[PDB]
Amino acid sequence: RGAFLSRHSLDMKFTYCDDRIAEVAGYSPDDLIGCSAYEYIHALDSDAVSKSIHTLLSKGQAVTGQYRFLARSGGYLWTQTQATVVSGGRGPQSESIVCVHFLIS
Ligand SMILES: CCCCCC/C=C\CCCCCCCCCC(=O)OC[C@@H](O)CO
Structure with a gap:
């Protein structure tokens, strides 16, 4: 019920995460x-996720490939993310990011 969202500052720090993360x-x-x-990105996928983030910041929207997200247990979940920038109202420095996530496995 509802898309699984998160919000981030430009350094990718979480500012909001869907409760269903538990x-x-x-x-x-x-x-x-x-x-x-x-x-929380598996080291094997870090470069590809960075490239997606570069595209996100250039074009304003991006979709990752599948990647591994570090679960609290230490295992990884296969995930994929679509993201957009969101203007902050104060100029470029105020931009933030909103993501929707999908569980691949
Ligand atoms: C380009 C920016 C890319 C930024 C990528 C990095 C940002 C955050 C890391 C991922 C956090 C969410 C992990 C759990 C996701 C669970 C999704 C979920 O449960 O989806 C159900 C859906 O598949 C319908 O069944």
Whole structure:
């Protein structure tokens, strides 16, 4: 029920995470807020996710390939993300990011 969303600052720190993160990955949203999403991407997928983020910032929207997200248990979930920038109202420095996520496995 409802798309699985997150919000981030430009450094990819979570500012919001869907509550269902507990059901899916063990975290509560409180565990992730203020933490950079880069820390939760499997090292094998980090470069590809960065390239997607570069496209996101250039074009304004991007879709990742499948990638591995670090669950609280230490295992990884295969995920995929569509994202957009969102103007902050104060100029370029105020931009933020909104994501919708999909579980691949
Ligand atoms: C380009 C920016 C790319 C930024 C990528 C990095 C940002 C955040 C890391 C991922 C956080 C969410 C993980 C759990 C996702 C669960 C999704 C979920 O449960 O989806 C159900 C759906 O498949 C319908 O069944």
